[PDB]
Amino acid sequence: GLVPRGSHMTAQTVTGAVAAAQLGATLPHEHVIFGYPGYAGDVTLGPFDHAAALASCTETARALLARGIQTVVDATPNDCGRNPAFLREVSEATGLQILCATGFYYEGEGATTYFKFRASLGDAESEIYEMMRTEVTEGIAGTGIRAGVIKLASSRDAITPYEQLFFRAAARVQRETGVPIITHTQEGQQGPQQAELLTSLGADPARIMIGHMDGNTDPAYHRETLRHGVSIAFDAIGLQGMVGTPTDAERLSVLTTLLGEGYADRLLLSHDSIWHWLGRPPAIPEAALPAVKDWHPLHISDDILPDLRRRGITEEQVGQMTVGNPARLFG
Ligand SMILES: [Co+2]
DSSP: OOOOOSOOOOEEETTEEEOGGGOOEEEEEEEEEEOOTTGGGGTTTSOOOHHHHHHHHHHHHHHHHHTTEEEEEEOOOTTTTOOHHHHHHHHHHHOOEEEOEEOOOOTTTSOOHHHHHHHHHSOHHHHHHHHHHHHHHTOSTTSSOOOSEEEEEOOSSOOOHHHHHHHHHHHHHHHHHOOOEEEEOSTTOSHHHHHHHHHHTTOOGGGEEEOOGGGOOOHHHHHHHHHTTOEEEEOOTTOOSSTTOOOHHHHHHHHHHHHHTTOGGGEEEOOOOEEEESSSOOOOOGGGHHHHHTOSTTHIIIIIHHHHHHTTOOHHHHHIIIIIHHHHHHO
């Protein structure tokens, strides 16, 4: 239907180039490791235990492979603990394909001091553009590992001036290389705005996935976003009633409405799970346990798909969402 148009490079995973057909069932938004900005300053008591993270992540990778998932797109921002070399370790040890990102978190929670400083002194947008293009076409941090996607994020109330520097640089790398763009939206807002801004800047809608769209429960919101021709991702499936996220029941209700309206070619599914936290492992208060109970990477394969199927979603629609769409968007 709507295929990518323009410059295009082969999907780049942490262990190298992969043919679109080799992508297979994919979870489009996950984090093997993740650390909120500041975690590095807690290194004395929250050090990274490499051998333990490697064993724990390889184990999650193997379970994903057991479900038939061959690929995970790691959406971790550059300022949130991103580590391509660790990701490659996990990929080499298990055979699970992993793509990583190039990009910064949103203004509300990212490490924003650096680039705001750069922006006050000069043209931050060019510096950001140059970083993204380098990481996507040459490699990250001298490692030879390239980012297979650009990650963008924005705040609840507006795409801030700080965030726009990134949207503009990303659009330019998108136009030049064809690399896909996945995003974060805050609390169910700005999806239409991100799609509008990115398309108006010349980025290809067929190579754009607006994320955290499950954060809004009014289907008209998803529909206005989808009008732009972009894909949307229900990507925090399993995280319930936390930070006001809705329940999975709410998400599936919107999702089956959209599936019923013919939107399969534009819907992607993920959990935004964190397999291993950077910093001190988080202590989840008693009360919060249920909100995170289904928040792990086997939740869609074991619970959501069977649920969609029994509700009448067809095998073909599930295939389109988990295999067709990722094949087109990232390959
Ligand atoms: Co995420």
